[PDB]
């Protein structure tokens, strides 16, 4: 088989970083996409190489900016022959009701959390179509599933939008054999109410992302939202 290549936005922290390292343990080559923490990205790359990635690259990108994403895309195309897995995990949190959410805050949240997913996926599709097999995993949130959670109105709207995008892309891209799924975690403990007495960690979400990314495990699953909330919402 061909070498496996995975790209993870928000790959230098939280869920994205945990996902990159989980992929490395699988022997998958990785591309760590980050906005500004070049230091954290390179240190993540060094751990990925130690853990098992044949190759680990870093690439700077602002997912909410079209030009930045277009450049990242070209840059990535110069480093790898194809892309098997794309994980969009570069979302940003937002809090507050509609009265306290200013128009600029609303727009910025949608630009990064929703438009960013569409942009990264759009520009990297040619690389994904070149792979013998491919999958896409978007990191949504329980906030996109329900209003009964403390999250800003823009955050909830953007995450629900990510879920809608995930489902439509799954059906539309199924023709190319590309699977598209999402994970919807509840509160996750990072460097920033439920029946099961545990605290979700980035590594817990990474396991779920790996399951959905790997065709050996989920080849028949597409357009699904895998909820990880320790039972807060069934």
Ligand X SMILES: NC(=O)C1=CN([C@@H]2O[C@H](COP(=O)(O)OP(=O)(O)OC[C@H]3O[C@@H](n4cnc5c(N)ncnc54)[C@H](OP(=O)(O)O)[C@@H]3O)[C@@H](O)[C@H]2O)C=CC1
Q: Which residues are catalytic?
A: 155
**What does 128 bind: a copy of itself, ligand X, none (CB cut-off 5 to 8 Å by kind)?**
none
Contact between 44 and ligand X by CB under 6 A: the answer reads no
Shortest Cβ 18–ligand X spacing (Å): 8
Regarding 167 and contact with a copy of itself (CB under 8 A), the answer is yes
- Residues 183-202 within binding reach of a copy of itself (CB under 8 A): none
Count of residues engaged in binding a copy of itself, rule: CB under 8 A? 43
Strands (E) across the chain are located at 5-9, 29-34, 56-60, 85-88, 134-139, 178-185, 225-228
Find out whether 96 is annotated in a ligand binding site.
no
Between CA 54 and CA 50 the distance in angstroms is 9
- Work out the burial of residue 102: count CB atoms within 10 Å of its CB; fewer than 13 is exposed, 13-18 middle, 19 or more buried: exposed
Q: Is 68 in the site for a copy of itself (CB under 8 A)?
A: no
Judged by CB under 8 A, does residue 46 bind a copy of itself?
A: no
CB of 164 to a copy of itself, least distance (A): 2
Structure tokens at 171: 């059906």
* 36 touches ligand X by CB under 6 A: yes
Residue 173 binds a copy of itself (CB under 8 A): yes
Nearest one of 86, 62, 39, 87 to 202, comparing CA atoms: 87
Query: Nearest to residue 17, comparing CAs of 90, 80, 124?
Result: 90
Identified binder of ligand X from the candidate list 30, 33, 128, 213, rule CB under 6 A: 33
Q: How many CB atoms lie within 10 A of CB 200?
A: 20
Report the alpha-carbon distance of residue 103 to residue 91 in Å, rounded.
18
Q: Does 139 bind ligand X (CB under 6 A)?
A: yes
Q: Based on CB atoms, which residue is closest to a copy of itself, 170 or 206?
A: 170
CB of 191 to ligand X, least distance (A): 4
Phi, psi of 159 (to 5 degrees): -70, -35
CB of 224 to a copy of itself, least distance (A): 11
């Amino acid at each position: 088989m061909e070498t496996t290549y995975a790209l993870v936005t928000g790959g230098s922290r939280g869920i994205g970083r945990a996902t990159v390292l989980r992929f490395a343990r699988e022997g998958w080559s990785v591309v760590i996409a980050y906005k500004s923490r070049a230091d954290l990205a390179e240190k993540t790359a060094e751990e990925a190489r130690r853990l098992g990635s044949p190759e680990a690259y870093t690439v700077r990108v602002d997912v909410g900016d079209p030009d930045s994403v277009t450049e990242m895309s070209s840059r990535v195309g110069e480093l790898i022959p194809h892309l098997n897995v794309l994980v969009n995990a570069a979302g940003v949190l937002q809090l507050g009701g509609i009265e306290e959410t200013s128009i600029s805050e609303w727009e910025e949240t949608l630009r990064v959390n929703l438009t960013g997913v569409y942009l990264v996926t759009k520009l990297l599709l040619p690389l994904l179509r070149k792979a013998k097999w491919a999958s896409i995993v978007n990191v949504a949130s329980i906030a996109g599933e329900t209003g009964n959670v403390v999250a800003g109105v823009a955050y909830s709207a953007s995450k629900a939008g990510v879920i809608g995008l995930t489902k439509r892309l799954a059906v539309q891209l199924a023709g190319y054999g590309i699977r598209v799924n999402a994970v919807a975690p509840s509160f996750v403990e990072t460097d920033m109410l439920h029946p099961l007495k545990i605290i979700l960690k980035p590594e817990d979400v990474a396991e779920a992302i790996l399951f959905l990314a790997d065709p050996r495990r989920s080849r028949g699953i597409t357009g699904h939202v895998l909820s990880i909330n320790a039972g807060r919402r069934t």
